[PDB]
């Protein structure tokens, strides 16, 4: 039980770190998609 408590704490910390990294990657990807949409809108406005 003591070993399981320590392992649960360590695994929770690792899962939190991995989820934070994945969330940061998702936010960066969404920002890149917004920048690409803005660039596409600017190119459509410049062509028109």
């Amino acid at each position: 039980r003591a070993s399981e408590e320590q392992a649960i704490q360590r695994r929770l910390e690792a899962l939190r770190a991995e989820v934070a990294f994945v969330s940061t990657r998702e936010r960066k990807a969404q920002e890149l998609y917004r920048k690409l949409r803005d660039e596409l809108e600017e190119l459509r406005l410049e062509q028109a």
């Binding site: 991995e18 990294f21 994945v22 990657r25």
Partner: protein, 47 residues
């Protein structure tokens, strides 16, 4: 004497399992880092 021999065998098995678990943890961490850092390149058509 039999219990001491079994305890020594279990200690050797536990050390071997600890080494194998460390190797598997390193492999799983490398695979997870590869999956997380995977970026989709430009999928150009086969011309």
């Amino acid at each position: 004497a039999r219990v001491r021999e079994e305890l020594a065998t279990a200690l050797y098995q536990h050390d071997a399992a600890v080494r194998v678990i460390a190797r598997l943890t390193r492999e799983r961490d490398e695979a997870r880092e590869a999956l997380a850092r995977l970026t989709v390149t430009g999928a150009a058509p086969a011309a």
